[PDB]
């Protein structure tokens, strides 16, 4: 068996396989996150658009359990393992806690494996951050966020992806108690972030909401598209 | 031996996989494969480089797969890897059989296959399997399907797609003539051959270069069936007639 | 006794130019019935089945552990599988577990998919083969079929007689036996079809 | 040298490198020679004193490998002793598995394939060392091999290892050692290692001897310090 | 416990080089032929054989695998044997199992599949040789070459080694479907002749057939009779 | 002519050298100075400690190994550890097995043989750390040191770690008295011994000296702080 | 190509850009450091190994010194090239020829032995991590049916079964003797002088070993000096 | 490329020497020890306002007379701050008593070297841990604070800082330190140095303190209790 030391430092503390990692990640799609008020949203920019695609097999949101869900930016391939991986943990907690898991217990888990994946032998680390949504038993609201290096922290609202660092900075300005005050609100804000950086702005993204209690539901073409005009024609105006 | 590693399962400077990268040239030189789904069915035809010589022929085909009673795939790229692929595919399918007592529904075979693509990525420091494979299937969750995965492990599914040599020509043509919900067997079979047509720049297309199988559902049963040459000469014969009416 | 447990009869007879293979239909636990429709014969083919008999859940392990290796087999081959190469694959698979065996004693029926000439064999558990040219039994009343299938059987019989004949052996094997029948089915194999019955039997 | 990294390489020419400096290291010790005779074996070692707050006795390169056969070494000394465990072993396990005292020449092969094991891979390094193995038995009479890092072994009826090996074979060869005894030879053994002692370049080395023949009833021994200081007396004057 | 990391690896271009040269120590291996005849097939090779020293019967290039099946090669010869234990093991292990002579279609793939994992599994090279191999099953004959990247072909004919663009090209204009086996040994020997340089004797060429009555090796004396007429 | 054999342990170099081995003896080089010494009847450890800035603990040099033995260390101190617990082991081991002390040399073979293990497996290290074993046995008192090499040495008496040498000549002068000092007066040496290490500027100090005694009648004891201000005046200099 | 190299291919076992295994050239090569030659020869009566003997110095126990090696009673061997690699060999052929016979109750025939040790060597050509034995093995022995046997094998994993043989520094002009002899329709004395000839020596009795096996008497027997003297004075005397 | 036990000529293991770097791109945390407890104060380093700052946890609980301040590669810390916790509750198990601190230390601190791709068990650690500990707490020798690098030195210290700022931190620690200090001048001077070393202005959400005393059990700062001590500025 293969027991090349792959992550390993550089002079300067750095250790480069994560940074590469890193790398990856910012070339993935964008993805945006915002923790509402009772709501939480997740939205996330195309993959490619392509006609002959089909929908279904491409969404970059993905259930771990009944009242927790993630996005990713990154390699696709590897944040399949991760899902997979957090799916088989969350059964596990369930089935010796008989709750569910906190959606940081399960953020936990999540960056513990990616963190170990950049201090074992034979192997690279993980090419995906993600964002990690859901509720907690007495009704409060998450979004965590993980990435390769196994670092995770709690967000009000977070971007991952390429153009992080403006969707970033879109929404240091824009969150705020009025954003947040209804669900659509919440939904615009995401959608709104997106469009800033959007190539196409239309679909393009995939969009998820959860409510508490009531589980992941997917938006809908039609229904995002009523959104994207409501914010293209308000970004006309302006000039 | 750190001197003589490759190092095949690390990152470079830009977050990228080089060999999977170049495992994917090795397939984009080989024979053009492509794969269409209809409404009463799904296909695949293939160009074939065993194609001909003094060559024999004593299997059913040469790049087309029957990976259980509801499935198969084609492939481009590494010959003897795609063999070590689609003889996983059978275990996998068998597996999930003996266990369920039900097929392994399509994209689940997809996704188990994908999994050990990307561990040859992630960990054990060998290079990558060189293939890309599309399959064809029916299942009783979303009928006939046809998805595509590549050597990062990668998959999706399509209505219509291209691997192999002239991919990228292949998809515009199918991008323009493909009919989202309206597609027939028969309209998906005229549309290949002039999608073949045009990116086999070995010029004049004939029924020993190209390989068709097709998958359909008859009596509750799915039936897989790689077209005899006289069926493919039939329908070059039909394309051929069909390029005019286009002129005057 | 282990063979016991479950109870159950198989049997298969050759005839002229096809094969019969035929079961009890009770699945029960030492006295009592829990079913009457009990599964004991499956398709490994077009023309070839094989019949098991022994403990139920070895009948089911067994039955889908030899699918699962005949699928990879016919998948990587051209082609249909034989039936003498069946019942080494058969044998194969048994004599694996001989320390620890699978309590079923299969009967095999079929045809050769190429020539079509008829096929009987029976394996003990532990995967010893036996080819015969005429019937094969195993089961909880194995006397008693081997009196019935000796004293009835003749070489050369068309499907009708061959029906009557395999149906008498089990019907009458089995109303000597407490822990089977409950019904009795028989598949009848020719060149061209399969014939699929249940027969009027006694319900104690 | 070019191809010189891993003892699993070839040179162009067909050497091995890596062995080549192995036995470069077991040529810039001091030298250690065995002699054998009419009715036993002699070892000698030039035994370098490099710092005066070393005790007498320490580094020892004459070893008991069993109680019938002596080891003396040239080279990395952690390596010898390493070697001289390895030794032990096999003639421990020898007389486990077949009753009785491992013959010389059957150790002497079986370490010497071990050595040789440390020769073909990159996973390991050779031995920096040469050693020596010296026994008598009435059976067997006396017996010297020699075994150096690549792993060959011959027998021998003199033999030097170490910096001042080639002078110190041209003074074993002025000795009629087949008709010499124990008692005879160590004398002969110390006047060597004063004679290719260079006292210019490294002043300071304790002379070790070790013995075994008919006069030890086949046990490999220390030669008492009475005698040794009786033929360090000789070299010495002997020299002057 | 060995190198784990492959020896063969894409390059930029996506080709597997150590593949690549391994087909050319094939190329630069002696030539041998293959000709699947209507009722049989036949191998032929030339021996690279140097020195009357040689005794030229010590050891074959043209081996049994089974009573149905045999080989031959181009390129390195240790390989080659590698291969030849590999290949009848792999046949013993099928009968067991199935009590039938393994197919020669199967046969090759489950050698094909040993040399492909020569070409990924840890700290080894591709092996050197390209393989030729013959039978006879389900009434017909067979003839398979293996390359080592574990691909495989099923021929009529064929040539591998030195000059084998031509000695295709040469069969080409000359085999026909409907020839004999008798007649397709002759056409083989004249393949070898195409590229020689030596003088044939029936001591530097090696022939072998299979039938329906099974694979062997034809004699020298055979041979000899073969190379009247030649 | 160096750099490609420097990085592997199993390389050896051109001239018959193993550059990893002696790299690994420039940690023991850059450690602070300990010095070992016997007479008779006593074996002492005497070793500066350093403390990282003003409001450290001075580092630990001395560590008890069994009653018998006790072992002053330099360079890697995860490695000394390590080392130590191996030590440690193979005294319980033989108190388990026959029921009395260790003899100290065989201890020290052991080291040898375990120390040796990784100076030729490729990617394994040199041990980085050298030790002054101090002990008492059947034999009486002793003083080893060992080494990355993996070789060891017998001593009368020694000393190890940075500005050793001027140690090392202070015990060559005066070595031929150790033999038969009083217990007070050996430690003296060791300290006389120890000080030539110090910058001119510099003193020993109850903070900056750890000593180490195991004899006939003393089992082997570690005086730090306080404890060794008995020994230190003492004060012989000037 | 015509010796071109990429990457790794001069320093482990992987093809060059002809499809080459420079490391395998390199240890025919190793065979020749030695600076010594052996032939074979078989008749049908009897099979011969001759060898240089060397024994420059004398200090040397020349006993000790051989290049001959018995496998079995009924084998013989003489090994050319680097000496510890051959002895390796020889005693990986006595365990193969050992375990044959436990596991086959007949003794191992020569080409099967050489066969084996054949494959064993090739595994050394196409593994990375272990380089090929610098050395060339020539068996002899009587098979029943087929009378005497002199088999070759090499780094290489190259075997055969020969009329006669050699190996080491003259090999090529050893093959041309004895090509040009073999042309025609006393094998100790062909022998003898083939290796005479290419050497330009005439030998004393110390200065060759003789090794044979007989139809008559098939175990394997090394020539003493006076037998082989007793060759060299019946060729003297042509 | 070479691996990673590889010495240098001046006798250091690269990957401790490049470990040790590391923990200088880490944010500032101080300890203290005194008579009647030990602080440990940290620089949360806050890079978003939309960040949550109570989920960034630099100071944890090892047991409730142990707590532990790190600096460095902070995911690298869980598996050493776990192992200390599992050690603490080993002991308990085994000898019913408390660990000490010392021996706290000690057990993470011989997971430090243990990397390497030769002898290797699992996929074993590839390297070191890009992580400084201080571990303060209060057993039987009283309160107690304890230093732990990648080196797997460790050893006691009356005061220390770590990461970017411990250069000049340490010289105002040296300068404010006294041995008879109570604990609310140690929290006060704790916070008088984070506030000169750290880039963001000081404030009751960016940074985090906890204490231990021989009265009462390892205490996480709340919020207003930080205002509180922020006031004196
Ligand atoms: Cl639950
Ligand atoms: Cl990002
Ligand atoms: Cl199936
Ligand atoms: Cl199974
Ligand atoms: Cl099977
Ligand atoms: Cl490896
Ligand atoms: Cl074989
Ligand atoms: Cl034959
Ligand atoms: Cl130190
Ligand atoms: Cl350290
Ligand atoms: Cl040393
Ligand atoms: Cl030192
Ligand atoms: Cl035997
Ligand atoms: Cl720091
Ligand atoms: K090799
Ligand atoms: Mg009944
Ligand atoms: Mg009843």
Not at chain 3, 29 to 39: E, K, N, P
Request: proline share 3%; aromatic share 8%.
């Amino acid at each position: 068996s293969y027991d090349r030391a792959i992550t390993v430092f550089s002079p300067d503390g750095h250790l480069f396989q994560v940074e590469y990692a890193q790398e990856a990640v910012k070339k993935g799609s964008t993805a945006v996150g915002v923790r509402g008020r009772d709501i939480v949203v997740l939205g996330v920019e195309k993959k490619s658009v392509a006609k002959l695609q089909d929908e279904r097999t491409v969404r970059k949101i993905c259930a771990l359990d009944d009242n927790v869900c993630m996005a990713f930016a990154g390699l696709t391939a590897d944040a399949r393992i991760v899902i997979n991986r957090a799916r088989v943990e969350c059964q596990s907690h369930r089935l010796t806690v008989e709750d569910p898991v906190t959606v940081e217990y399960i953020t936990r888990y999540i960056a513990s494996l990616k963190q170990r994946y950049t201090q074992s032998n034979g192997r690279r680390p993980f090419g995906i951050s993600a964002l990690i949504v859901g509720f907690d038993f007495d009704g409060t609201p998450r979004l965590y966020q993980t990435d390769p290096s196994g670092t995770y922290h709690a967000w009000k609202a977070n971007a991952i992806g390429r153009g992080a660092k403006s969707v970033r900075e879109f929404l240091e300005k824009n969150y705020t108690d009025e954003a947040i005050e209804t669900d659509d609100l919440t939904i615009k804000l995401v959608i709104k972030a997106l469009l800033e950086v959007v190539q196409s702005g239309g679909k393009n993204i995939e969009l998820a909401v959860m409510r508490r209690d009531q589980s992941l539901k997917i938006l809908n073409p039609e229904e995002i598209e009523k959104y994207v005009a409501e914010i293209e024609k308000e970004k006309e105006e302006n000039e | 031996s750190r001197r003589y590693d490759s190092r095949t399962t690390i990152f470079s400077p830009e977050g990228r996989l080089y060999q999977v990268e170049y495992a994917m040239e090795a397939i984009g030189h080989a024979g053009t494969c492509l794969g269409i789904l209809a409404n009463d069915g799904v296909l695949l035809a293939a160009e074939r480089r065993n194609i001909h010589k003094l060559l024999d022929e004593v299997f059913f085909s040469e790049k087309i797969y029957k990976l259980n009673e509801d499935m198969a795939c084609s492939v481009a790229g590494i010959t003897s890897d795609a063999n070590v692929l689609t003889n996983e595919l059978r275990l996998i399918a068998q597996r999930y059989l003996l266990q369920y007592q039900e097929p392994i529904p399509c994209e689940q075979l997809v996704t188990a296959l994908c999994d050990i693509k990307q561990a040859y990525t992630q960990f054990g420091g060998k290079r990558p399997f060189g293939v890309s494979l599309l399959y064809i299937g029916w299942d009783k969750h979303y009928g006939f399907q046809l998805y595509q995965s590549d050597p990062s492990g990668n998959y999706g599914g399509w209505k219509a797609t291209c691997i192999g040599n002239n991919s990228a020509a292949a998809v515009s043509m199918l991008k323009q003539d493909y009919k989202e919900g309206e597609m027939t067997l028969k309209s998906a079979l005229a549309l290949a051959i002039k999608v073949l047509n045009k990116t086999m720049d070995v010029s004049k297309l004939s029924a020993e270069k190209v390989e068709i199988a097709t998958l359909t559902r008859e009596n509750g049963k799915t039936v897989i069936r790689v077209l005899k040459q006289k069926e493919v000469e039939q329908l070059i014969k039909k394309h051929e007639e069909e390029e005019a009416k286009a002129e005057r | 006794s282990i063979m016991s447990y479950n109870g159950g009869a198989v049997m298969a007879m050759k005839g002229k130019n096809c094969v019969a293979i035929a079961a009890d239909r009770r699945f029960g636990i030492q006295a009592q019935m829990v079913t009457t429709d009990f599964q004991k014969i499956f398709p490994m083919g077009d023309r070839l089945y094989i019949g098991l008999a022994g403990l139920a859940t070895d009948v089911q392990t067994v039955a889908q552990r030899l699918k699962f290796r005949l699928n990879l087999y016919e998948l990587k081959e051209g082609r249909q599988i034989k039936p003498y190469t069946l019942m080494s694959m058969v044998a194969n698979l048994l004599y694996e577990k001989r320390f620890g065996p699978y309590y079923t004693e299969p009967v095999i029926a079929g045809l050769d998919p190429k020539t079509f000439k008829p096929f009987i064999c029976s394996l003990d558990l532990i995967g010893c083969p036996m080819v015969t040219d005429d019937f094969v039994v195993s089961g909880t009343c194995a006397e008693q079929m081997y009196g019935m299938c000796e004293s009835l059987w003749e070489p050369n019989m068309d499907p009708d007689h061959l029906f009557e004949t395999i149906s008498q052996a089990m019907l009458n094997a089995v109303d000597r036996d407490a822990v089977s029948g409950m019904g009795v089915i028989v598949h009848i194999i020719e060149k061209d079809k399969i014939t699929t019955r249940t027969l009027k039997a006694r319900m104690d | 040298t070019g191809y010189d990294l891993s003892a699993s390489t070839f040179s162009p020419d067909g050497r091995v490198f890596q062995v080549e400096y192995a036995m470069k290291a077991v040529e810039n010790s001091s030298t250690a020679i065995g002699i054998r005779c009419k009715d036993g074996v002699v070892f000698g070692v030039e035994k370098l004193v490099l710092s005066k707050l070393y005790e007498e006795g320490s580094n020892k390169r004459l070893f008991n490998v069993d109680r019938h056969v002596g080891m003396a070494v040239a080279g990395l000394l952690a390596d010898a002793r390493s070697l001289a465990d390895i030794a032990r072993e096999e003639a421990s396990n020898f007389r486990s598995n077949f009753g009785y005292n491992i013959p010389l020449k059957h150790l002497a092969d079986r370490v010497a394939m071990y050595v040789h094991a440390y020769t073909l891979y990159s996973a390991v390094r050779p031995f920096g060392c040469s050693f020596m193995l010296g026994s008598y038995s009435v059976n067997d009479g006396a017996q010297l091999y020699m075994i150096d890092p690549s792993g060959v072994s011959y027998g021998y009826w003199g033999c030097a290892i170490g910096k001042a090996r080639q002078a110190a074979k041209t003074e074993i060869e002025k000795l009629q050692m087949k008709e010499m005894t124990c008692r005879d030879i160590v004398k002969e053994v110390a006047k060597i290692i004063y004679i290719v002692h260079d006292e210019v370049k490294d002043k300071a080395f304790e002379l070790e001897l070790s013995w075994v023949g008919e006069l030890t009833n086949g046990r490999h021994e220390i030669v008492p310090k009475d005698i040794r200081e009786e033929a360090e007396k000789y070299a010495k004057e002997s020299l002057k | 416990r060995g190198y784990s990391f492959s020896l063969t690896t894409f390059s930029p271009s996506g080709k597997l080089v150590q593949i690549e040269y391994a087909l050319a120590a094939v190329a630069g291996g002696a030539p041998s032929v293959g000709i699947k005849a209507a009722n049989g097939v036949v191998l032929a090779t030339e021996k690279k054989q140097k020195s009357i020293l040689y005794d030229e019967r010590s050891v074959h290039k043209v081996e049994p695998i089974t009573k149905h099946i045999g080989l031959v090669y181009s390129g390195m010869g240790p390989d080659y044997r590698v291969l030849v234990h590999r290949a009848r093991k792999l046949a013993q292990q099928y009968y067991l199992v199935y009590q039938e002579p393994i197919p020669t279609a199967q046969l090759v793939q489950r050698v094909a599949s040993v040399m492909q994992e020569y070409t990924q599994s840890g700290g080894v090279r591709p092996f050197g040789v390209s393989l030729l191999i013959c039978g006879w099953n389900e009434g017909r004959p067979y003839l398979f070459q293996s390359d080592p990247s574990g691909a495989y072909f099923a021929w009529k004919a064929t040539a591998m080694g030195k000059n084998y663009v031509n000695g295709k090209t040469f069969l080409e204009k000359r085999y026909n479907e409907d020839l004999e086996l008798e007649d397709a040994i002759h056409t083989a020997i004249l393949t070898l002749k195409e590229s020689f340089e030596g003088q044939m004797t029936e001591d530097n060429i090696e022939v072998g057939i299979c039938n329906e009555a099974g694979f062997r090796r034809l004699t020298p004396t055979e041979v000899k009779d073969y190379l009247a007429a030649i | 002519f160096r750099n490609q054999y420097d990085n592997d342990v199993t390389v050896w170099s051109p001239q018959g050298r193993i550059h990893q081995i002696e790299y690994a003896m420039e940690a023991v080089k850059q450690g602070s100075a300990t010095v070992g010494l016997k007479s008779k009847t006593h074996a002492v450890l005497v070793a500066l400690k350093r403390a990282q800035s003003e409001l450290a603990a001075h580092q630990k040099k001395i560590l008890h190994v069994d009653n018998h033995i006790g072992i002053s260390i330099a360079g890697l101190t995860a490695d000394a550890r390590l080392l130590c617990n191996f030590m440690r082991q193979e005294c319980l081991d033989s108190r388990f097995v026959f029921d009395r002390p260790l003899p100290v040399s065989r201890l020290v073979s052991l080291i040898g043989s375990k120390t040796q293990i990784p100076t030729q497996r490729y990617g394994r290290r040199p041990y980085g750390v050298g030790l002054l074993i101090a002990g008492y046995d059947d034999m009486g008192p002793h003083i080893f040191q060992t080494c990355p090499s993996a070789n060891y040495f017998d001593c009368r008496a020694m000393s190890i770690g940075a500005r050793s040498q001027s140690a090392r000549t202070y015990l060559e002068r005066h070595m031929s008295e150790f033999m038969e000092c009083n217990l007070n007066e050996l430690v003296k040496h060791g300290l006389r011994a120890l000080r030539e290490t110090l910058p001119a500027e510099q003193d020993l100090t109850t903070k900056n000296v750890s000593i180490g005694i195991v004899g006939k009648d003393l089992e082997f004891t570690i005086y730090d702080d306080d404890d060794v201000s008995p020994f230190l005046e003492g004060l012989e200099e000037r | 190509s015509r010796g071109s190299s990429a990457g790794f291919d001069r320093h482990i076992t992987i093809f060059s850009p002809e499809g080459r295994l420079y490391q395998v050239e390199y240890a025919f090569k190793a065979i020749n450091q030695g600076g010594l030659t052996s032939v074979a020869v078989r008749g049908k009566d009897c099979a011969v190994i001759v060898t240089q003997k060397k024994v420059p110095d004398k200090l040397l126990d020349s006993s000790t010194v051989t290049h001959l090696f018995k496998i079995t009673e009924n084998i013989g061997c003489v090994m050319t090239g680097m000496t510890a690699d051959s002895r390796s060999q020889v005693q990986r052929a006595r365990y193969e020829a050992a375990n044959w016979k436990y596991k086959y109750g007949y003794e191992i025939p020569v080409d099967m032995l050489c066969k084996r040790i054949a494959d064993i060597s090739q595994v050394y050509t196409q593994n990375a991590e272990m380089r090929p034995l610098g050395c060339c093995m020539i068996l002899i022995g009587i098979d029943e049916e087929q009378g005497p046997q002199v088999y070759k094998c090499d780094p290489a994993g190259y075997y055969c079964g020969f009329k006669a043989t050699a190996a080491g520094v003259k090999q090529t002009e050893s093959t041309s003797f004895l090509e040009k002899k073999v042309k025609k329709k006393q094998t100790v004395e062909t022998a003898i002088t083939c290796l005479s000839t290419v050497l330009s020596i005439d030998f004393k009795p110390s200065e060759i070993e003789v090794g044979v096996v007989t139809v008559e008497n098939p175990k394997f027997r090394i020539l003493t000096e006076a037998e082989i003297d007793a060759h060299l004075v019946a060729l003297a005397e042509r | 490329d070479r691996g990673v036990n590889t010495f240098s000529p001046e006798g250091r293991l690269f990957q401790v020497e490049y470990a040790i770097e590391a923990i200088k791109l880490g944010s500032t945390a101080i300890g203290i020890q005194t008579s009647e407890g030990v602080c440990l104060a940290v620089e949360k380093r806050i890079t978003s306002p939309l960040m949550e700052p109570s989920s960034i946890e630099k100071i944890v609980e090892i047991d409730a007379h142990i707590g532990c301040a790190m600096s460095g590669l902070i995911a690298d810390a869980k598996t050493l701050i776990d192992k200390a916790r599992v050690e603490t509750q080993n002991h308990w198990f085994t000898y019913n008593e408390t660990m000490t601190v010392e021996s706290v230390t000690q057990a993470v601190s011989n997971l430090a070297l243990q990397f390497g791709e030769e002898d290797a068990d699992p996929g074993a650690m590839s390297r070191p841990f890009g992580v400084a500990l201080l571990f303060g707490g209060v057993d039987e020798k009283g309160p107690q604070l304890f230093h732990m690098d990648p080196s797997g030195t460790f050893v006691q210290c009356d005061a220390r800082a770590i990461g970017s700022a411990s250069e000049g931190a340490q010289s105002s620690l040296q300068e404010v330190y006294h041995k008879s200090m109570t604990l609310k001048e140690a929290i006060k001077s704790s916070l008088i140095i984070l506030k000169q070393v750290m880039e963001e202005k000081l404030n009751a959400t960016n940074i985090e303190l906890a204490t231990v005393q021989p009265g009462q059990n390892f205490h996480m700062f709340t919020k207003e209790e930080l205002e509180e001590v922020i006031k004196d500025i």
